[PDB]
Amino acid sequence: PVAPACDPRLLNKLLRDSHLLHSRLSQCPDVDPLSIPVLLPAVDFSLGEWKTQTEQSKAQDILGAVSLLLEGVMAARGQLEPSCLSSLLGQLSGQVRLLLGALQGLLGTQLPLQGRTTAHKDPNALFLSLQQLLRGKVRFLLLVEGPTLCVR
Amino acid sequence: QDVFLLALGTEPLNCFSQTFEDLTCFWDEEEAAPSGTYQLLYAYRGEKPRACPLYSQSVPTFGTRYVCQFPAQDEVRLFFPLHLWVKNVSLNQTLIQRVLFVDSVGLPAPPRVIKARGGSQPGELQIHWEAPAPEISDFLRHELRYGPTDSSNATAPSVIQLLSTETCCPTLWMPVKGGSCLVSGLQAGKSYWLQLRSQPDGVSLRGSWGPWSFPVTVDLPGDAVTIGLQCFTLDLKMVTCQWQQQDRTSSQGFFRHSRTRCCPTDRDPTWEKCEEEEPRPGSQPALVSRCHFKSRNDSVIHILVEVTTAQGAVHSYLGSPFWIHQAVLLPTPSLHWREVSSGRLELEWQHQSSWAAQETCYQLRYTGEGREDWKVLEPSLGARGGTLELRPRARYSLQLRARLNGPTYQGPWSAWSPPARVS
Amino acid sequence: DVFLLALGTEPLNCFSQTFEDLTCFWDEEEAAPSGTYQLLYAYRGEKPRACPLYSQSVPTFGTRYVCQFPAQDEVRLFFPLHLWVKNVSLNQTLIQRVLFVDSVGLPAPPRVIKARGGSQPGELQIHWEAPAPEISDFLRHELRYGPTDSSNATAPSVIQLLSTETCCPTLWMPNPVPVLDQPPCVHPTASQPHGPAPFLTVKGGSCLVSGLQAGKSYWLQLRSQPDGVSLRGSWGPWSFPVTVDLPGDAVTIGLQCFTLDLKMVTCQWQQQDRTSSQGFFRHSRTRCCPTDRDPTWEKCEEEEPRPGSQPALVSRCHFKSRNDSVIHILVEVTTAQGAVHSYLGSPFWIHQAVLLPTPSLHWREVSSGRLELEWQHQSSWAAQETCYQLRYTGEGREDWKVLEPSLGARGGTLELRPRARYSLQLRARLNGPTYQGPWSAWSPPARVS
């Protein structure tokens, strides 16, 4: 009955795993720019607009943001050759694929549209973008609005 | 305190924000300069630079500082990189450069419109505050400091963190978003001052502590034991209480009960009026007051009394909480005795009210004719009167009292039975 | 074995243990050659894909087929997973099921279980390390226990563990390389270990089971189930049994301990033939989830000035005290054959253990056969509130008269036959609510009349 994302321990677990995965990037020998850039979601937002946007619009935008992140991560994994960095990007794809399902379990399947996009080239951007999206719109939605979404 | 002094920090071109829909940056310089010599340029990532309209203030015994607040003409975006360059215009030289995330600097304002009251039990402090900027109110953590107003200066004021529990709610909606929290262990009867501040939670928004609020004086009510409050209930349907009278004063009492210890309301506690006895039939001197009201057996009871002086001032006193089974006013027992021999007697009770009498904690004393030397006994819970000894056919008398201490109940001491001559 | 517990009431059963791995199986009594089966799978909106099946012979239930999903990206928690079982040549779906991986979790039991006698006789401190640390936030726990000498008994006495002031289902237990100087109940609290930069540590949990009967061995077992809030699943298998020997209640050796001066505590206990004993003590402030280190103890020092009195039945010992916390005590006995045993004393506050010395019994006859009783004034800080107790009898008699006055009262009064022979004796306890002292030893008997 109750959605899976509505357990706050799930969001905390996602945050802890994301920050652990970001820190692990320092360990493996080297990182080089992706030969072809990757599209990442619009994480930037202002508190002025957030307090006025309709809840349906917020859910519809955050679902599309996570989906576009997943699409970018899959393209990055497709481009990179077998190596430690590719394994880290696979493990991050696991985080993003968990996050999308957790969000769909509460917000329902709703037709997303792309926002503004930045064609990044640094592989660190994907971990950074995931962490920014998790700290931002995700926790914003699940705390400001959460108690009204989770009942029924 | 002042926000600029908390911002100053450890890095040139300091910045801070109080609501995360605003931004202020400043820096202090050793020597003054004429107008137009410097300019503050900023640019969110992927945008062309623009300028911030600066202004300046003298720094006490340290020099002069240049300050700009980001104009309302543009929106402040939080999780979005922002570059800051300060240019010497005459040289077109950058003096200080910094990279900033608006979510990475923050000095949230202290909660305005603080109010506080005496809590539910003595030593409790109720705290209520309205968020100064309500949108971010859930992304903050608060801490609290308090001290006595007499400045007795045994110690500097203590500080506690306001973590979310059953009793303390950092965030609530109210009929305007805010919070409420209950603090305990403070010394009753003495007046306190109160201060609050907050910091970003460090997960979504990151920063440090903002300025403290203005001090608010709170007059905690005294523990009612200092005025001799004693409450009791003969049966579950009615409660009676009494407290010591003062010559030049008048007083009244009130009661309340609750099932739970939730975060308190904005509105003041709604006491129910207790009703007095018939005074003139009761006691013309009225050296001690008395009051009564109907009760129940499902909840904890709280009682407050207030006294007014002939000068006109008012003081309030708060009684200790009790469960109803801790307050059973069992009547005087049916003391019974039987001599096994002249000068040696067993003691017992005339059977009645067994639902309570079978487990109560009797207590007794006795002495001889014209004497004032007291013999005593204290048997076990629910025990019979036991036994006692005396000189054969000599004059003696006894008296007893009891409390419903058998773990079926937790009652307090009842008034003594009348003294009775058994020998 | 785990495979038994996943079968339930379904034709096809899968289970995930770490929630990042997956295996699925089904049973049939018959047997088949290789290549006759495929476990096709697909998540919502994909082209079907084949699991790398392998086969296993189990005559208890015929033949069992098992696949292990590639852990890289083929396990997804909250998306629906389609499952099709069919013979590839015949091409008909024998079994079909749609599964969310988050609903079939089978958690592994905790490993490295360590347990020891707790703070009191009958307390059992358990400390365990949780496998799959990343999911330990979402688990319930269950414990079995039963005596070793009860093989006939169908009595596991299953109990469920949950968070209390004295129970901690999950903690970031402090240190891989600890030192015993660490204060009790220390754990990283809000400053959770940020990976291998600080000590990456076991993410375990530890807490006390209570109410066991002391002085004998127990076997212990532990298992877990996801709590079902967001991750749902069935109970996992039990851990392998481990045995803990609880200490016996010191009442079985007549342990008594007390202080006469609020600064030095004297303890005494009996002894047996061909045995010897030694004493220990400790202090602790509050009940809380213990650390992994064994409790610290300090030796007690013998009373003997070499007196020669030879009360060979009892050992008596002393140590200096403090009044900031409750006190614990321990006694160990050694056999002639070298074996050792442990006894644990009941804890007390120091003021519940104050045995003020024998009172200054005083008496004065108001008349022949009627006398008041009182005390020679001394030790007023304690004597003013202590609960005196007395008894007396006649010459050569064994019939006892008794008195017990109020808390802190004088000796009161007594009556007797005029000029007949009588004698009395008294003892006291510091029962006045300023203190809670126990019964002190009796004063010497005196022929007060």
Ligand SMILES: *[C@@H]1O[C@H](CO)[C@@H](O[C@@H]2O[C@H](CO)[C@@H](O[C@@H]3O[C@H](CO)[C@@H](O)[C@H](O)[C@@H]3O)[C@H](O)[C@H]2NC(C)=O)[C@H](O)[C@H]1NC(C)=O
């Ligand atoms: C909460 O308090 C009420 C009173 O305000 C309790 O009501 C009590 O109810 C019992 C029966 O349930 C009554 O017992 C009866 O007593 C008469 C003698 O008075 C006896 O002859 C009958 O055979 C019967 O035993 C009782 O009188 C009544 N009041 C009191 C003071 O006991 C109520 O029981 C309380 N709540 C709970 C959960 O018990």
Ligand SMILES: *[C@@H]1O[C@H](CO)[C@@H](O[C@@H]2O[C@H](CO)[C@@H](O[C@@H]3O[C@H](CO)[C@@H](O)[C@H](O)[C@@H]3O)[C@H](O)[C@H]2NC(C)=O)[C@H](O)[C@H]1NC(C)=O
């Ligand atoms: C905790 O325990 C300590 C001892 O273990 C208690 O200290 C005792 O305190 C009393 C009252 O202050 C002392 O009596 C006083 O002794 C001085 C001489 O030192 C004398 O001049 C005074 O007239 C008075 O009799 C007593 O000596 C002292 N005992 C020891 C062994 O030092 C203490 O009271 C306990 N409680 C607290 C809260 O500390």
Ligand SMILES: *[C@@H]1O[C@H](CO)[C@@H](O)[C@H](O)[C@H]1NC(C)=O
């Ligand atoms: C200042 O110098 C920079 C190069 O360092 C140049 O791009 C900029 O245009 C100069 N300022 C103005 C006002 O032209």
Ligand SMILES: *[C@@H]1O[C@H](CO)[C@@H](O)[C@H](O)[C@H]1NC(C)=O
């Ligand atoms: C002493 O009292 C003053 C207020 O008069 C206060 O500012 C100061 O902190 C106090 N110091 C201590 C040590 O309590």
Ligand SMILES: *[C@@H]1O[C@H](CO)[C@@H](O)[C@H](O)[C@H]1NC(C)=O
């Ligand atoms: C296999 O079974 C499916 C489902 O009934 C059917 O559509 C298909 O024609 C069969 N044969 C092949 C070669 O797929």
Ligand SMILES: *[C@@H]1O[C@H](CO)[C@@H](O)[C@H](O)[C@H]1NC(C)=O
């Ligand atoms: C046998 O059962 C009794 C219960 O009647 C129990 O007390 C005893 O410990 C058991 N002994 C064994 C060896 O199982």
Ligand SMILES: *[C@H]1O[C@H](CO)[C@@H](O)[C@H](O)[C@@H]1O
């Ligand atoms: C009854 O009354 C006595 C005082 O006379 C208390 O000290 C006791 O605790 C009980 O409440």
Ligand SMILES: *[C@H]1O[C@H](CO)[C@@H](O)[C@H](O)[C@@H]1O
């Ligand atoms: C003193 O000693 C008696 C036994 O003689 C105990 O039963 C009592 O509780 C107190 O500790």
